[PDB]
Amino acid sequence: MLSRNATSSYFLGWQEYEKNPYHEVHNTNGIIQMGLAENQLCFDLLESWLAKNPEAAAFKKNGESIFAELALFQDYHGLPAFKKAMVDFMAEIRGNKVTFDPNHLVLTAGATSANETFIFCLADPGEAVLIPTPYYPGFDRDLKWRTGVEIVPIHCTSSNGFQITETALEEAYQEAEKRNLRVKGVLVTNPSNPLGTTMTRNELYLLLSFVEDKGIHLISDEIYSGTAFSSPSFISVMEVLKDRNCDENSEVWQRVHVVYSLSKDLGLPGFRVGAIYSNDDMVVAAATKMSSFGLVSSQTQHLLSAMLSDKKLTKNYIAENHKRLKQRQKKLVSGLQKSGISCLNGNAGLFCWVDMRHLLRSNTFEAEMELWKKIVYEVHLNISPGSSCHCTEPGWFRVCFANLPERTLDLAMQRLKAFVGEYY
Amino acid sequence: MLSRNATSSYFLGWQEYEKNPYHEVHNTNGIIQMGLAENQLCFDLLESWLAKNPEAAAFKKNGESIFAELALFQDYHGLPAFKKAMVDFMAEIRGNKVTFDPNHLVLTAGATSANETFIFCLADPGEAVLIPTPYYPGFDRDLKWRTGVEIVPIHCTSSNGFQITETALEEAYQEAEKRNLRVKGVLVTNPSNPLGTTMTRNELYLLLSFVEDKGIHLISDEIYSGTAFSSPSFISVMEVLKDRNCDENSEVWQRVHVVYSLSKDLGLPGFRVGAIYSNDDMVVAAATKMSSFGLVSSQTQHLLSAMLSDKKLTKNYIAENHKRLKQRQKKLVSGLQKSGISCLNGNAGLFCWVDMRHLLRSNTFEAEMELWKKIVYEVHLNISPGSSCHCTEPGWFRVCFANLPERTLDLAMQRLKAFVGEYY
Numbered sequence: 001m002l003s004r005n006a007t008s009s010y011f012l013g014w015q016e017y018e019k020n021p022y023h024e025v026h027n028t029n030g031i032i033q034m035g036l037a038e039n040q041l042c043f044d045l046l047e048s049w050l051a052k053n054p055e056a057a058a059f060k061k062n063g064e065s066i067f068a069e070l071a072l073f074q075d076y077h078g079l080p081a082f083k084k085a086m087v088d089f090m091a092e093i094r095g096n097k098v099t100f101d102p103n104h105l106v107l108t109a110g111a112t113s114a115n116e117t118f119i120f121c122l123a124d125p126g127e128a129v130l131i132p133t134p135y136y137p138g139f140d141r142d143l144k145w146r147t148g149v150e151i152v153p154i155h156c157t158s159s160n161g162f163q164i165t166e167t168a169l170e171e172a173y174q175e176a177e178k179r180n181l182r183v184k185g186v187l188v189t190n191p192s193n194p195l196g197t198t199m200t201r202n203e204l205y206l207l208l209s210f211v212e213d214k215g216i217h218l219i220s221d222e223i224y225s226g227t228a229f230s231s232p233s234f235i236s237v238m239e240v241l242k243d244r245n246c247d248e249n250s251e252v253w254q255r256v257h258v259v260y261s262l263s264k265d266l267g268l269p270g271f272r273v274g275a276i277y278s279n280d281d282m283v284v285a286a287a288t289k290m291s292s293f294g295l296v297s298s299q300t301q302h303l304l305s306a307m308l309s310d311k312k313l314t315k316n317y318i319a320e321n322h323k324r325l326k327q328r329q330k331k332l333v334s335g336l337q338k339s340g341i342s343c344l345n346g347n348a349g350l351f352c353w354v355d356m357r358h359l360l361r362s363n364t365f366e367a368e369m370e371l372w373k374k375i376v377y378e379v380h381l382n383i384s385p386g387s388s389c390h391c392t393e394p395g396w397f398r399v400c401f402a403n404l405p406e407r408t409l410d411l412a413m414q415r416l417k418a419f420v421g422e423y424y
Numbered sequence: 425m426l427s428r429n430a431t432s433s434y435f436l437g438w439q440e441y442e443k444n445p446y447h448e449v450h451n452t453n454g455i456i457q458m459g460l461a462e463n464q465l466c467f468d469l470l471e472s473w474l475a476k477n478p479e480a481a482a483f484k485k486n487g488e489s490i491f492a493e494l495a496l497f498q499d500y501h502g503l504p505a506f507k508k509a510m511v512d513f514m515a516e517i518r519g520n521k522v523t524f525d526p527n528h529l530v531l532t533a534g535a536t537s538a539n540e541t542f543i544f545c546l547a548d549p550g551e552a553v554l555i556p557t558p559y560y561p562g563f564d565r566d567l568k569w570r571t572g573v574e575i576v577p578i579h580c581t582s583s584n585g586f587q588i589t590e591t592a593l594e595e596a597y598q599e600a601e602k603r604n605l606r607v608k609g610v611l612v613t614n615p616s617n618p619l620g621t622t623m624t625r626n627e628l629y630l631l632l633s634f635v636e637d638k639g640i641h642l643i644s645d646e647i648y649s650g651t652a653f654s655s656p657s658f659i660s661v662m663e664v665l666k667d668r669n670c671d672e673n674s675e676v677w678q679r680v681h682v683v684y685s686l687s688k689d690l691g692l693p694g695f696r697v698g699a700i701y702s703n704d705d706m707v708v709a710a711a712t713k714m715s716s717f718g719l720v721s722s723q724t725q726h727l728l729s730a731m732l733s734d735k736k737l738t739k740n741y742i743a744e745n746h747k748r749l750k751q752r753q754k755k756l757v758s759g760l761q762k763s764g765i766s767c768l769n770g771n772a773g774l775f776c777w778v779d780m781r782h783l784l785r786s787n788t789f790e791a792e793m794e795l796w797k798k799i800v801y802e803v804h805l806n807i808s809p810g811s812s813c814h815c816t817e818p819g820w821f822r823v824c825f826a827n828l829p830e831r832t833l834d835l836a837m838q839r840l841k842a843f844v845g846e847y848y
């Protein structure tokens with residue numbers, strides 16, 4: 001009797017790309033990848049740093065080999081130097097408006113591991129967490145698969161730019177009741193995937209007030225925090241906790257947590273560097289013990305400790321990343337406009353939330369899937385349909401702009417315009 | 425309401441060492457670490473290889489930089505070249521008597537992650553797995569904490585060298601019944617931690633016959649497979665499946681699995697390289713998706729793919745590791761003999777299972793703890809008491825011999841003899 005745990009367009013389109021991937025030389029007619037949120041815009045900056053500072057990657061420290069020491073380093077508290085470099089980098093991303101205690105930071109194998117661990121720590125099987133829609137498709141697996149925890153949506157609509165409202169929060173909490181589920185917290189993504197927008201101060205205060213009243217937790221996945229390239233300003237959930245008489249007052253501050261990773265800003269998803277940050281000593285202790293199942297390679301911790309300790313590098317990287325991200329997003333927005341397609345006004349992330357409602361046969365998700373399939377097979381472009389992100393409104397699509405060359409992006413825009421000018 | 429999951433001498437003695445660690449220059453009277461199974465005997469061989477082949481660590485392949493490619497590599501199927509190097513290395517460890525399909529190998533962040541994942545895949549919360557005692561203390565957390573699975577012991581005694589017997593298996597299966605638990609499989613460690621012995625062909629056939637009759641799974645944690653330094657020969661569970669009319673016959677072959685890691689033979693625990701191997705396509709698929717929570721750093725996968733692809737290195741490493749391990753084990757055995765202390769005749773691992781029953785005040789675990797504490801505070805040596813490994817017989821201790829300099833081992837033996845010659 002095989003177990004239970006051992007026994008979706010987002011993953012579908014991805015596989016379709018694998019079958020016939022685009023190549024500017026071999027398969028110039030293949031499918032162009034615009035459905036995965038990755039950042040290939042600044043590798044030259046990191047490659048340059050590595051060329052000038054070869055010691056870290058060589059298992060050398062102060063001209064001394066520390067291969068053996070690192071090979072043996074498996075402490076679940078993480079490499080001291082790396083934890084310090086990380087909290088400093090997290091502070092810098094936030095304009096030094098907030099500071100993080102390295103003893104309250106827990107390293108994990110990517111945010112994928114961090115989010116699951118947070119759920120294991122805050123909710124028991126059969127309980128639930130509330131999540132604003134639309135949200136990252138991966139959460140359906142990360143937060144529920146091995147945890148036995150359920151997701152209850154906090155529906156957001158285009159009427160107000162997909163922002164969280166009081167009514168949406170209570171409606172979600174009430175649906176949790178109808179489903180006989182006990183709510184343990186709210187998990188938000190700030191900046192938002194797939195919206196490409198930074199959370200507003202208003203939304204943050206609304207969330208804090210809500211979790212305070214309900215006596216639950218607030219987890220903020222801020223993996224895109226370093227990718228805010230245009231106004232308005234990114235506001236970490238930890239900044240709102242600063243001045244509000246909650247530093248050492250109230251008790252809600254103990255229930256606010258952050259998830260981070262180096263996958264999206266630095267473009268290092270393969271290195272699996274994730275992190276959990278909590279003000280609650282017990283959560284930190286539990287998460288630390290849990291990190292045993294997904295520790296970060298000491299080889300990687302050492303390399304990045306050296307990299308992130310270079311203040312000239314971090315400063316220039318964030319600045320250039322913002323510059324290149326803004327330029328690329330503008331190119332996508334401009335390219336889509338030429339096809340009469342608009343986007344939700346965004347300012348962060350590695351993608352745009354695109355409005356293709358006017359291209360639907362009808363206002364239904366069935367019509368959305370029809371359009372999606374047509375874009376995949378006829379236009380040969382892989383983008384994500386809003387339904388994969390649980391958007392309540394048919395017609396929205398997530399289009400990633402930083403995981404391919406600029407020229408390939410232009411090609412994608414050309415092929416899309418030919419498509420719209422052909423049928424509509 | 426904080427969750428449940430978020431809310432032992434093995435870990436105790438370890439912490440006591442941290443408080444007052446030994447140092448041949450600064451704290452020559454501190455506690456000597458002999459309670460953790462790590463291998464510091466062959467780093468010079470790896471350091472030498474790295475000095476001669478600097479490209480892998482430099483993110484270079486054929487003189488070309490592949491930093492960006494590796495930075496972006498996060499595929500849960502693992503790096504092709506590394507998977508191939510791993511299956512080849514696993515075959516070599518087994519004298520090429522068995523071959524492994526890389527498509528059936530799943531990389532994980534250490535065997536800690538591999539074992540937990542196997543449990544998630546084969547058992548539901550509330551069910552159980554049988555484990556021969558004594559066993560690795562870490563299993564009490566790895567196999568049960570987040571899985572909700574229980575452990576039912578298969579008691580082994582010194583009467584026959586702590587080998588598994590038919591009677592012990594049925595008694596375990598029956599106890600599972602008394603506890604109202606459904607047994608899903610048996611997890612063994614071969615070579616054994618803490619026994620330091622290789623499983624016999626007899627035991628292997630007994631286990632296979634048992635899981636066949638019960639219709640359950642057999643998981644063999646062979647993390648110590650490359651550390652068999654003396655007769656008898658190590659026999660992988662996969663070898664016994666070779667010739668027995670089960671290659672394509674019977675169905676038990678589909679329920680036999682292996683866990684491996686590079687933590688103990690190569691001494692790379694900090695790099696977190698673990699692996700799951702299964703003949704069942706569905707288990708592989710499930711474990712692959714689960715590895716998302718604990719992927720191996722691509723930086724590390726690349727480095728070791730190059731290292732393990734060097735057949736001259738792997739051959740010389742295994743040979744030298746065996747040589748040095750045997751020499752060190754003999755030194756511990758010889759040192760203990762001078763204090764009138766004998767060990768279970770072992771031939772593998774990084775530790776010896778020591779018989780100190782004659783040093784107990786009485787045949788009780790209470791007496792065992794008394795002796796243990798005396799060795800920690802009076803002798804200033806950290807070793808693990810058998811009860812931490814769930815041994816049914818009081819008086820046995822696990823003593824690790826490869827995680828310190830030879831001279832420090834001798835010092836430990838000197839201090840131990842003074843102890844026994846003082847009270848007994």
Ligand SMILES: Cc1ncc(COP(=O)(O)O)c(C/N=C(\C=C\OCCN)C(=O)O)c1O
Pocket residue numbers: 035036037038109110111112113136138189193221223260261262263269273274
């Ligand atoms: C909000 C959010 N949290 C966590 C993660 C996981 O990141 P980690 O730190 O584990 O690497 C992602 C990755 N997002 C995507 C994942 C893509 O992976 C597929 C291959 N490119 C995505 O396309 O939105 C994310 O968007």
Ligand SMILES: Cc1ncc(COP(=O)(O)O)c(C/N=C(\C=C\OCCN)C(=O)O)c1O
Pocket residue numbers: 459460461462533534535536537560562613617645647684685686687693697698
């Ligand atoms: C049978 C067995 N399986 C799995 C593991 C986990 O290894 P991984 O591949 O995750 O690194 C161990 C580590 N064994 C010990 C762990 C020690 O860690 C403590 C710090 N040295 C031990 O002392 O017996 C082990 O002995």
